[PDB]
Design a protein around this ligand. Structure first.
Ligand code: NI
Length: 341
């Protein structure tokens, strides 16, 4: 049945709650972003109102074939009324189209649901600064102090310089980047840009990216693999077997693969700096795991909450075990005592 942390009190609303069948008394289903754990259950047979960003609405229509009449896209940073309740969608700094949702309850309570987010100081200057938030439904994916990672900028710098060096030394090297969902497009787009190539991909992935309002996308991506030296593949195929195979398919155009796997976190972060990352190599194939995250680090998350000063925090991730729930609650208390709220 629908968990409490997907229900918005004082409303008929749910957030990211599409796999429970008809939720009793739900009048509007909100979707924060187009990732499968959140959209699971939508299809062309869904006949309730779905509220979301424009980009998420493009992906619902084109990829899942949801009918137009049930998709209600809203502009960002704009006060809107939904079943008589004022709402605002804010940029979540997650994947394309991902939003946070501010609800202004008729009784005066103000609720922020972060969806999935990567907290950033820029958020401290959006419409959030203008009023107090009483309840926060928080993306706690990496809510433990061992989760540190570099900025997105530093990670792309590493990937560009690595790819550019390799291909300049060997003009017959192929670059491959793994993907399994939208997000992290900057990885493959920045590499193609430095190399003066388009990124080649399957028809299904080219379709997905054409839904995202990315400026000058017809200029950066293509379904012609032959004319491209940056290839995108499913994340599952980013291993020595899968890559030796792909190389066979390129018909002696290439003699070396350099591959990137943008993971969220991996324990090499606790020790290793970004400067100090090395690949796994077999034969003429090298694989780099880079820590490109679209979720908050522990320190980024802590700053955001100590800035916002909510009266109540409701975690949405890692809620399935008592030890996790209990540990998160202890961090929330420290933050509150250190900051004085
Ligand atoms: Ni997500």
């Amino acid at each position: 049945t629908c968990p409490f942390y997907k229900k918005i009190p004082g409303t008929g609303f749910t957030v990211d709650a599409f796999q429970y069948g008809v939720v009793e008394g739900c009048t509007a289903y909100f979707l924060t972003h187009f990732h499968s754990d959140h959209y699971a259950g939508l299809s062309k047979h869904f006949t309730f109102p779905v509220y979301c960003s424009e980009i998420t609405g493009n992906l619902l229509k084109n990829k899942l074939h949801v009918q137009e009449q049930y998709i209600h896209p809203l502009p960002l940073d704009t006060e809107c009324i939904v079943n008589g309740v004022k709402v605002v969608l804010l940029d979540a700094n997650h994947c394309p189209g991902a939003v946070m949702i501010l609800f202004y309850l008729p009784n005066g309570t103000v609720i922020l649901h972060t969806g999935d987010f990567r907290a950033d100081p820029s958020m401290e200057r959006s419409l959030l600064a203008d009023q107090k938030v009483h309840m926060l439904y928080l993306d706690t994916t990496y809510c433990s102090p061992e989760y540190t990672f570099p900025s997105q900028q530093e990670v792309i710098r590493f990937a560009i310089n690595t790819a550019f060096e390799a291909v300049t030394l060997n003009p017959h090297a192929l670059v491959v980047c793994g993907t399994y969902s939208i997000g992290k497009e900057k990885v493959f787009l920045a590499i193609a840009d430095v190399l003066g190539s388009k990124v080649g991909m399957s028809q299904e992935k080219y379709k997905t990216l054409q839904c995202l309002n990315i400026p000058e996308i017809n200029s950066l991506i293509t379904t012609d693999m032959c004319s491209s030296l940056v290839h995108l593949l499913p994340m599952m195929q980013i291993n020595f077997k899968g890559l030796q195979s792909h190389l066979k398919k390129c018909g002696g155009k290439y003699n070396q693969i350099l591959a990137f796997r943008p993971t969220g976190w991996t324990h090499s972060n606790k020790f290793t700096r970004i400067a100090d990352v090395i690949p796994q190599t077999k034969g003429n194939i090298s694989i780099y795991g880079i820590p490109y995250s679209e979720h908050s680090s522990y320190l980024e998350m802590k700053r955001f909450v100590q800035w916002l000063k909510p009266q109540k925090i409701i975690p949405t991730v890692n809620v399935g075990t008592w030890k996790s729930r209990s540990t998160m609650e202890k961090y929330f208390r420290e933050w509150k005592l250190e900051a004085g709220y």
